[PDB]
Design a protein around this ligand. Structure first.
Ligand SMILES: CC(C)(C)NC(=O)NC1CCN(C(=O)[C@H](Cc2cccc(C(=N)N)c2)NS(=O)(=O)c2cccc(-c3ccc(CO)c(F)c3)c2)CC1
Ligand SMILES: [Cl-]
Length: 240
């Protein structure tokens, strides 16, 4: 996250960190039940010969605050049973950039480990709404990840504006969120993490960090997968 600030301990207890064998933190995810996470398909594609699609080469950290303190109180470490990539995911366009990760053993809910509510298929996040992005991604384009979980408040962008700003690249599965003046944005390593929409104190996951043209540039807001469209796919494949 570029332009954000340190999250408080326990503040985003649905945020998960996904580590790939021998590489440290690579992507984010969100807890939606004791057994299931939501993440980005593109994180789990074989590439450069490393087998990112191999569920046995991932470790999920739940309840994590600081990447240098992975044995801290409240952290739950889990292996993955399987990765369900969306069948329409396209690795050239990044259309349908979503995946479901099954934990080997269930999480135990705690002050630091809690699920986030799914939106039903009719749920709207209108252009202009302020929502939150979190992750351990880079804090500058071309920089390094954050040890402490970062948070940033960003705004939903109009879909026509989004299309014109990133021409020939936006599909209806995608939403632009950020600021047209840049400054606050997700970045490499935030992929797969949640957009958290805070209302009356109810919180919904609005989308999934997917991609961007650089990070925090003017007129180049981050691009996110829209979660309401996938409610029935999640139910069908996980029961959640
Ligand atoms: C293994 C596999 C082949 C699947 N690749 C993979 O997973 N690549 C990841 C893809 C996701 N990545 C990025 O989009 C990065 C960083 C980033 C990440 C998340 C949010 C933001 C943000 N700003 N909110 C920014 N941004 S980037 O460096 O500009 C870059 C590098 C490579 C590729 C494309 C890219 C994007 C879109 C299109 C479609 O038009 C495209 F053609 C290229 C952008 C890392 C790298
Ligand atoms: Cl504002």
């Amino acid at each position: 996250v570029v332009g954000g600030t340190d999250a408080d301990e326990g503040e985003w207890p649905w945020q998960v960190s996904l580590h790939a064998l021998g590489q440290g933190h690579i992507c984010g995810a969100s807890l939606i039940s004791p057994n299931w996470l939501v993440s980005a398909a593109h994180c789990y594609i074989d590439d450069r010969g490393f087998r990112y699609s191999d569920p046995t080469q991932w470790t999920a950290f739940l309840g994590l605050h600081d990447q240098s303190q992975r044995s801290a109180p409240g952290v739950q470490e889990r292996r993955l049973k399987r990765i369900i990539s969306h069948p329409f995911f396209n690795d050239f366009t990044f259309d349908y950039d979503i995946a479901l990760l099954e934990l080997e053993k269930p999480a135990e809910y705690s002050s630091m480990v809690r699920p986030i509510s799914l939106p039903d298929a009719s749920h709207v996040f209108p252009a202009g709404k302020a929502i939150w992005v979190t992750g351990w991604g880079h804090t500058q384009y071309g920089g390094t990840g954050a040890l402490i979980l970062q948070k940033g408040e960003i705004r939903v962008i109009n879909q026509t504006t989004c299309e014109n700003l990133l021409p020939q690249q936006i599909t209806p599965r995608m939403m632009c969120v950020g600021f047209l003046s840049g400054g606050v944005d997700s970045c490499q390593g935030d992929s797969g993490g949640p957009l958290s929409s805070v209302e009356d104190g109810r919180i919904f996951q609005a989308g999934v960090v997917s991609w961007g043209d650089g990070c925090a540039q003017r007129n180049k807001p981050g691009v996110y997968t829209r979660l309401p469209l996938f409610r029935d796919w999640i139910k069908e494949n996980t029961g959640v």
